Amino acid sequence: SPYLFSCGEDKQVKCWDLEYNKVIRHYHGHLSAVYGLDLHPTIDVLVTCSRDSTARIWDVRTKASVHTLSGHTNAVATVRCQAAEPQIITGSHDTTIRLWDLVAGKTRVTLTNHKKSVRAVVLHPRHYTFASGSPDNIKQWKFPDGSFIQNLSGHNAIINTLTVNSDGVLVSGADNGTMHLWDWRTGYNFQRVHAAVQPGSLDSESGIFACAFDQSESRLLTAEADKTIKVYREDDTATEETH
Amino acid sequence: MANRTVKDAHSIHGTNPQYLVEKIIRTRIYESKYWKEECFGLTAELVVDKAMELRFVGGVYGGNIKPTPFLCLTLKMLQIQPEKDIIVEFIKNEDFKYVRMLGALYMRLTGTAIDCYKYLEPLYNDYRKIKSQNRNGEFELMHVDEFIDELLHSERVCDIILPRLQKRYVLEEAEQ
Amino acid sequence: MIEVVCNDRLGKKVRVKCNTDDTIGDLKKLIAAQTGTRWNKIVLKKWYTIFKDHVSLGDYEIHDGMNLELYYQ
Amino acid sequence: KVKRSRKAPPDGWELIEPTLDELDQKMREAETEPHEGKRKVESLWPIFRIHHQKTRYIFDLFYKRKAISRELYEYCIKEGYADKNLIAKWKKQGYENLCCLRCIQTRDTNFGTNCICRVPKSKLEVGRIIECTHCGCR
Amino acid sequence: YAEPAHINDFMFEQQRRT
Amino acid sequence: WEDADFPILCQTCLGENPYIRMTKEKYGKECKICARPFTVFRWCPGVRMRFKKTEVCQTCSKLKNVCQTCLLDLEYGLPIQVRDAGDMLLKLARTTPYYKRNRPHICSFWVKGECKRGEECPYRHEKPTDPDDPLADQNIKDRYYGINDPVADKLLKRASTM
RNA sequence: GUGCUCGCUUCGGCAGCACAUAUACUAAAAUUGGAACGAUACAGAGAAGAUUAGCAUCCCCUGCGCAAGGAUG
RNA sequence: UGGUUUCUCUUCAGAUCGCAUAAAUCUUUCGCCUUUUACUAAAGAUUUCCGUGGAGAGGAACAACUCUG
RNA sequence: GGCUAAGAUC
RNA sequence: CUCCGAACGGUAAGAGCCUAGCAUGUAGA
C-alpha cells in the first residue's frame, strides 16, 4: 500500500502516507519510544515493536490496536512479520527471543541462545528459513518452531543491522564500524571491511546502525552513525579464495 | 407525606394524579402554612370540613408564590383521589357556593370528557357570587356562572391546564 | 433606552430593550417575547429580591447592561 | 372517524356501515381503557381482539359469504378496515383461525419457534390452560 | 465434559416432549 | 473480563429430562458471588417448574464446587458449612431430590386473597413457610460461605438423633 | 380449526387422511432498606512569617472529549 | 426463450455513483486572543451519516397476462 | 537518584 | 445599513438539630 509509515521515539507511530506527503493516521498507544516497525505482507496490520514493556499489533486503516503481545521482560527491539512463520518473531533485549502468535498473542517458543541483549533479526526466504542474530554469540535459526543450525563467526561488537540478500550474502552492521560481511551458507566472513568516518565527526563515531539491500539487489545501502548514508556497490574479482 | 395519599388506587389521564398542576406551582404549594397544617392528616370527611370553612376562589398571589386554600384543597383532593360518587356529591351539594366550585376544579382536571360536559352544564344556571383573589392580592367579585364558563373556556385557569378530548361542536356530532 | 439582559440559568439568556420610565409589567412582556413563556408566570429575582408588578424601571436605577436572573413561577 | 381518502366509496359500503362502526367504537373504547387490572401485556389483548374480529368480518363477507364487491373490498383494505397481511395468512390452509400476526413471526421467540397460539390442544400437553402473552389467546 | 451434536433441534424437541 | 461457555450446575437443577434448552446472556445479570457479570444461563426444568437461571459467578463457583442455582454442593448435596465440617458427605447426602428446588414462587395475590389470575396462574397458590424457623432467613454470603449457615446447623444436629 | 375420503354410509353424525408442534427476565405482586449542603439558630475568611521553584519513573468528580480542570503516594 | 412486483443479504462502486451536499478528525495557514471549549475560512486527504447503482440467494400477490424475439 | 539557567544564591 | 455569542475561570470555609422525589425484584426450607 502507498503509505511510508514511520516510528518515532516520541511515543507516536506517525503513519505518514505518501499520497499527500503528510500524516494520515497518527496512531498511538505505546507508553514509551518505539524501537522498530514491520509491515506484514499478508495481514493488514503493522507490528510496532515499542520499548515501554512490549510491542503492539496496530491495525492499518483502523487506527486501533489488535492485541498486546506482552512476552518480553525488556524492550522489544527487533521485529519480524513473515508470512511463512505463523507467529510474529519479536526480538527482546532480555536475552530471550520469542515467537508470539498473531491470533492468540502468547509466545509459542522462546530461544535458548543469544546470551547478550538481542537487538537484531534477519530473514533469508530465498532458499532457506529465516535466520536470527545477536550482538555477542549470534546463531542461525529456523522458521518452524526454531532450530539452531550454526553459530556466528568472531564478531563480538554490538550488532545493530543484520541484512541478508537472496544471492547468499550476509551483511552484519555493528556499532563499532566493523561491517563484517559473511555468507548465509558457508558462514566465513568474505570481506569483513571497516568503513571510514566523516571529517566533521569524531574518531570513534562511525557505526552501522541500519543496513538494507536495494530492491534490485545491486548496490548495498548502510546508514552509518556519522551522519552519512553510505552506498556500497559491487565489483567483480576472483582473488578472494577463503581457506 | 407528599407523594400520594393512596398507594395504588387509580391514575390521572396522562401522569400521576399529584403531577396534574404545574411543577413550579406544586413545589411552592408543598411548602405552605395552610398546606403543612392540612397535609399531616386529611380524610374524605375531613376534606368536606376544610372546604366548607374557606370562601375564596383563586390561585397564587404576591411576589413569592402564595397559594390560595382553594388551590391547596384541590391538590389535597387530587392526592387523595376519591371516588366518583364523592366528587359528584361535592358538585351537587348546595351547602356552600365554594363547595360546588371546589368540586368543579377536580371534575375538569381528572374527569372524563363526557363527564366534564355533563357535570358543568347544570352549574351554568347558578347566579350567585363569590370572592376571587387577584394577582395583587386584592379580592374581586366573580359570579358562579362566570367561573363555570371560564372552566369551559380556554385553558387560562389559576394553575390549571387540561384540554378536553374535543370541543362542544365536535362532541355534538357524536353524542348530545 | 436600557438593554436589560434577562440572563437566567441553562442557556435562557436574552436581551430586552425597554424605556427608562417603562414599568416592570412592560418589561416582562418584552422578556416573554424573546424567551417563549407566559409573561404572567415570570418572576425576576436578584438575590432573593422578587420584583413587584407596578414599579417603574427608573425607580430601581436599572441602567444599561444591568442583567437580571429570570425565574419562573 | 375520517375515511382519509374523500374519494366517494362505492356501493355496499352503506350495507357494512353500522357493522364496522360498532367494531370501531368498541376498539376506541378499549383504547381508552386504563392500565389498571391488566398485568403487563393484558391491556394490548383487547387491541388485537377487536382487530381480529374486524378482519374476520371483511374476510367472511369476501370469501365465505362473497356478498361484498371487490371494489368495496379494495377500498376497505386501503382505508384500514382490515389488514392485508392478516387476510393473506388466512388464505393458506395451514392457518385459518390464527390469534395474531405477531405469533406467526419466527424471529419473535427467544428459542426460535412458534407460540402456543399456533398449536392444537390434542397435540399439546394434558394439563395446560396457558394463553399466548404476545398474541392474546389460543 | 461437553460433547455437542449436529442433530436437528426440531426433531429432538418433538421426540423428547412426546 | 468474565466470560463463560457452559454452566457448572447440578443434575437436580438441570431438569428431570434428558433434553433441555438453555439461553445464554453474555455479561449480564450482575452475579453477586464475585460482583462481576457472568453468562446468565436460563433454562426450563420441566412442566410446572420455576424456570430459573444462573445466579452465582463462573470463577467464583469454581472454588466452592457447588450448583449454579441451588449452590449446595457438587456430589453429596450438603451446604458448604456442612461440607467443610467433615465419609460424612456419604451419609448426609440424599438421592432423588424434591421438586421444591424447581418449584415456582408463591402467588402474592393468593396470599392477599384477590387471586384474579385463576387456574392459569403460573405461581403456586399454596401456604407459605413458617417465618419463625431459621430455614427461611438465609442470605447471599450466608449460603455461599460456611459462616451463619442454618441448613448446615440442622444437618449436623439431626445426624445424631437416635 | 380448515379441505378431502368411490370409508361406516346416513347425508343427523362418526372414523381416517393432509396442514398447523412448545410464546412467557413468567404477576394486577410481596416486602426490603434512605440520600438535598436544603431552610432555620449559634461564631464569622484572621487586625502578622527566614528554604529559592518544576519535570516522569497510584485513583474519584465536572465535562461529549484523542482539549482541559480539582485532589493525590 | 416464458414473471410484473415487493421485502430480507453478498460484492465492487472511479458515472455530476449525489443535475444537491452535512458533521467530525489529521497536516499546514489567517483574524481575534485572556485559561480552555464552543470559534472565521483558504488548501489537501481520512471517517461517520442522509442515500443510490449491476448480479447471483430466500418469501408474498393472477403468474399466468402470455412480454421481447 | 536523573534532567532543568557553575540553578540562580549573602 | 440590520453579523444577534454561550459556558468555565464565581458565590466558599463549619459546628448541633430537622424533614424528604429516589433503588433491588433472587437461590434457600
Read out DSSP for C42-71? EEEESSS-B--SS-BTTTTT--TT--BEEE
CA B51: distance to chain centroid? 11
Rounded CA separation C35/C5 (Å) = 11
Helix (H, G, I), strand (E, B) or coil at F73: coil
* Alpha-carbon span F80 to F66, nearest angstrom: 8
Distance from residue F38 (CA) to nucleotide J23 (C1'), in Å? 22
List CB contacts (< 8 A) between F21 and chain E. 13
Decide if F143 contacts F79 (C-beta within 8 A).
Answer: yes
- Residue where the block lists cell 429580591: C49
Q: Specify the resolution in Å.
A: 4.2
**Closest among B119, B42, B121, B27 to B78, alpha carbons compared:** B42
What is the spatial distance between Cα B78 and Cα B160, in angstroms, rounded to a whole number?
A: 13
Rounded-to-integer distance, Cα A19 and Cα A41, Å:
20
Cα distance between residue F71 and residue F55, in whole Å: 9
Q: Label the pairing between strands C2-7 and A34-39.
A: unpaired
Of B58, B136, B19, B67, nearest in space to C73 by CA: B67
Q: What's the CA gap between D45 and D132, in Å, rounded? A: 10
Query: Strand H: which of residues 74-93 in chain D lie with Cβ below 7 A?
Result: 88, 91-92
Calculate helix-pair angle for B84-92, B113-120, nearest 10 degrees.
20
Inter-chain touch E16–F21, beta carbons under 8 Å: no
Euclidean distance between CA atoms F138 and F149, whole angstroms:
7
Query: What CA–CA distance (Å, rounded) separates F142 from B115?
Result: 58
The Å distance, CA of A51 to C1' of H27, is 27
Asked if C73's CB is within 8 angstroms of B65's CB, the reply is yes
Find cell 565489483 and name the residue.
A235
Cβ atoms D26, D54 nearer than 8 A: no
Other Cβ atoms closer than 10 A to A18: 12
Burial status of residue F78 (CB atoms within 10 A of its CB: 0-12, 13-18, 19 or more): buried
> Total structural domains in chain D?
1
Please report, as a single letter, which amino acid is at residue B59: G
Domain ranges, residue D81:
1-138
Name the minimum distance, in Å, from the CA of D107 to any CA of chain F: 15
Are F149 and F143 contacting, i.e. CB atoms less than 8 angstroms apart? yes
- Return d(Cα F154, Cα F77) in angstroms, integer: 14
C-alpha to C-alpha distance for C70 and C43, rounded to whole angstroms: 6
90-149 on F, CB < 7 Å from strand J:
98, 100-103, 105, 129, 133, 135-136, 138-140, 142-144
CA angle, B151 then B39 then B8, to 5°: 80
C-alpha pair distances (Å), F113 with each of D129, F117, F119, F136: 21, 11, 14, 23
- CA–CA dist A27, A66 (Å, integer): 12
- Partnered with residue A159 across adjacent β-strands are A174
CA distance A132 to A147: 11
Of residues A125, A131, A122, the one with CA closest to residue A151: A131
User: What is the distance between the alpha carbons of residues A172 and A164, in angstroms, rounded to a whole number?
Assistant: 9
The experimental method, as deposited, was cryo-EM
Phi/psi at A199 (5° precision): -70, -30
* Helix (H) or strand (E) run with residue A91 in it: strand A87-92
Q: Report the distance separating Cα A141 and Cα B97, nearest Å.
A: 106
To test the contact with chain C by mutation, choose from B21, B23, B24 the residue with the greatest count of C C-beta atoms within 10 A, namely B24
Residue of F nearest to D126 (CA): F47
CA dist list (Å): D50 to D22, D28, D75, D99: 10, 10, 20, 11
H/E run at residue C18: strand C13-18
**Within a 10 A sphere around the Cβ of C62, how many other Cβ atoms?**
20
Strands A22-23 and A15-17 turn out to be antiparallel
F47·D129 Cβ contact <8 A: no
Helix/strand/coil for B74? helix
Helix B69-80 × helix B97-110 angle, to 10°: 50
- Residue pointed to by grid coordinates 398546606: B35
Give the whole-angstrom CA distance, residue F156 versus residue A190: 86
Cβ atoms of B69 and B77 within 8 Å: the answer is no
Distance CA B116, CA B128 (A): 21
Closest protein residue to G29 (Cα–C1'): F108
The DSSP annotation for B83-134 comes to -HHHHHHHHH--S-HHHHHHHHHHHHHHS-HHHHHHHHSGGGG---EEEEE-
Q: Which residues of C touch B (CB under 8 A)?
A: 40-41, 43, 50-54, 72-73
Q: Is the CB of A24 under 7 A from strand H?
A: yes
Q: Residue B70: in which H helix or E strand, if any?
A: helix B69-80
C69's grid cell: 436572573
E-state strands within chain F = 22-31, 36-43
Backbone angles phi, psi at B84, to 5 degrees: -75, -25
Strand A193-194 vs strand A208-212: parallel, antiparallel, or unpaired?
unpaired
Neighbours of D126 (CB within 10 A): 6
Q: What is the Cα B171 distance to its own chain's centre?
A: 23
For residues F72, F77, F78, F81, the Cα torsion angle rounded to the nearest 10 degrees is -40
Report whether F16 contacts F46 (CB < 8 A): yes
The answer to whether the C-beta of F119 is closer than 7 A to strand G is no
Q: What is the spatial distance, in angstroms and rounded to an integer, between the CA atom of A19 and the C1' atom of H15?
A: 24
Distance from C-alpha of B84 to C-alpha of F43, rounded to nearest angstrom: 48
Which cell goes with B139? Answer: 379580592
Around F98, how many Cα atoms within 13 Å sit in the side-chain half-sphere?
Answer: 5
- Residue A15 is which amino acid? C
Q: Which residues of B touch C73 (CB under 8 A)?
A: 24-25, 28, 60, 65
Q: What is chain E's percent helix, strand, coil content, to nearest 5? A: 50, 0, 50
Nucleotides of strand H lying closer than 7 angstroms to a protein CB: 26-27, 44-47, 60-62
Cell of D45: 389483548
What number of other Cβ atoms are within 10 A of residue C73's Cβ?
18
| Euclidean distance between CA atoms D82 and D56, whole angstroms | 8
Which residues make Cβ contacts (< 8 Å) with residue B118, sequence separation at least 6? Answer: none
* Helix H or strand E encompassing C29: helix C24-35
CA distance F70 to A45: 48
Distances from the Cα of D101 to the Cα of B49, D88, D106, angstroms? 56, 10, 11
**Separation between Cα atoms, residue A47 and residue A80, nearest integer Å:** 8
Cα A79 to Cα A58: distance, rounded to the nearest angstrom: 13
Polymer length of chain C: 73
The residue among C21, C17, C20 whose CA lies nearest residue C29 is: C17
Q: Across-strand partners of A13?
A: A27
Q: Number of helices (H) and strands (E), helices first, in chain E? A: 1, 0
Which residue bears the cell 543450525?
Answer: A149
Residue at the smallest CA–C1' distance to nucleotide H44: A20
Rounded Cα distance, B143 and A108, in Å:
95
Name A residues 26-45 whose Cβ lies under 7 Å from strand H.
26
Residue A56 exposed, middle or buried by CB count within 10 Å (0-12, 13-18, 19+):
buried
D118 Cα to chain B: minimum distance (Å): 36
Residue found by looking up cell 355496499 in the block: D12
Whole-number Å distance between alpha carbons of A66 and A90: 16
Asked whether B27 and B67 are in contact (CB, 8 A), the reply is: no
Which candidate, A122, A26, A29, A14, places its Cα nearest to that of A78? A122
- Number of neighbouring beta carbons within 10 Å of residue C7: 14
**HSE on the CB side for A145, CA within 13 Å?**
0
Can you give A100-161 as a three-state secondary structure string?
EECCCCCEEEECCCCCCCCCCCCCCCCCCCCCCCCCCCCECCCCCCCCCCCECCCCCCCEEE
